[PDB]
Design a protein around this ligand. Sequence first.
Ligand SMILES: O=c1ccn([C@@H]2O[C@H](COP(=O)(O)OP(=O)(O)O)[C@@H](O)[C@H]2O)c(=O)[nH]1
Length: 465
Amino acid sequence: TPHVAIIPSPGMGHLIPLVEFAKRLVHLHGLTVTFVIAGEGPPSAQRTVLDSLPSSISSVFLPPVDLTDLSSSTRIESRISLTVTRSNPELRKVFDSFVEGGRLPTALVVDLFGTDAFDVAVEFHVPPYIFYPTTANVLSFFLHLPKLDETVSCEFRELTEPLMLPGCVPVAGKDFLDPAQDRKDDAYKWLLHNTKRYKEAEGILVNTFFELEPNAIKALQEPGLDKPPVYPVGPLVNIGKQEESECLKWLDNQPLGSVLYVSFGSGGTLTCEQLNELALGLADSEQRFLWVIRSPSGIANSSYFDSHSQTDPLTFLPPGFLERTKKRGFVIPFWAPQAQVLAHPSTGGFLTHCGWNSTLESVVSGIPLIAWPLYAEQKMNAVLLSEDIRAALRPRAGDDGLVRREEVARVVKGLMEGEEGKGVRNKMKELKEAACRVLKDDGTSTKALSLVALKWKAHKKELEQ
Ligand SMILES: O=c1ccn([C@@H]2O[C@H](COP(=O)(O)OP(=O)(O)O)[C@@H](O)[C@H]2O)c(=O)[nH]1
């Protein structure tokens, strides 16, 4: 059977969907999968995700890459991209051992920043594929970026008209994903470099689905200059049926649909001032909430690589906040069993950083959103979710960028109980239905993944014969 090697670039938001993808490949398509894990140190969260997999899935952990030459100011996308790039020598060794074992992969699947691993795929005559863990809208942006880079000579924030790619929500230059915001920085150089390599992929599998981004998917699937086949295969998520304990026990004690979940992904934190206003506004709202909290930082993605929290986040909360909210709020530091929370009947809303896994998980459970983007492509996702899909409400930030407690309370109440939240709640109901539809045996996302697996089985067949 085809053996598929999956090489994630660092990030829980890459590993998680890739694990869901691997499980589908083994359980639904009878393939074997090996994760080849590049990084700087042992896995953290990561082990919980890689644990308990079918034996048709193995993991190889490469020697840690030397990124000691990088300045502490290095942007995450540089670090993420270079972790895969500098790992190529160790990846070659792993491929040699696959060859010796009679298990040369039928495909090498990288994620959105891992395209330099294509060098190893090409060297071993293994078809390269990209598993793209965020939206068809942002994928369109990535595929266009080589052209945009060529045709536009200002920093993107200076553009006076929004970018409006076929089928895509318009996005202002100033809202393009974080690594696009400073074209002199290595983060842009690595972003650009990756995007230039997308045309080398034999296929791009994208974690989204037709009803969610119909216009962008249609556009992506139209023949184009140097454009690879694009396969929507989502929503590939943890549906939250696995057996942290205390916060779920708390949740069990709350009324149906009553709890606002609040979480900023695996790597997001707020400034001090924003943490303070959010706490105060959550309390003001008088809504029930379950907040996964991290210590504040001036850098929104400062926790991206962190295995744990050195400081106690609770020490940053305002006077009396924990007292006032003792019954109606549950504050959990650093990590929650999010898939379980979003699938829980007592959950009714999600204040999200708009990371795409969090978004998909929320869609699959019909949970409406407040869109609170922080970094990476989250602002692009927030524009898509609020202006096009219309499944998120957005808080108003002041001219200093601060969302004040009054706005927090207003939007929370709007989502949980108010008229403004009925539109988004209804839209999420429709998307929840659609999420089921597309993953049925003859659902569009299932069809797309099946086409890829079939291509891999055929390739293996031809090679071995
Ligand atoms: O406390 C948390 C925070 C995050 N997650 C999971 O981590 C992933 C976060 O990925 P996402 O794309 O939403 O954002 P990222 O972490 O990449 O910014 C999602 O699967 C979440 O369910 C979790 O289990 N517990």
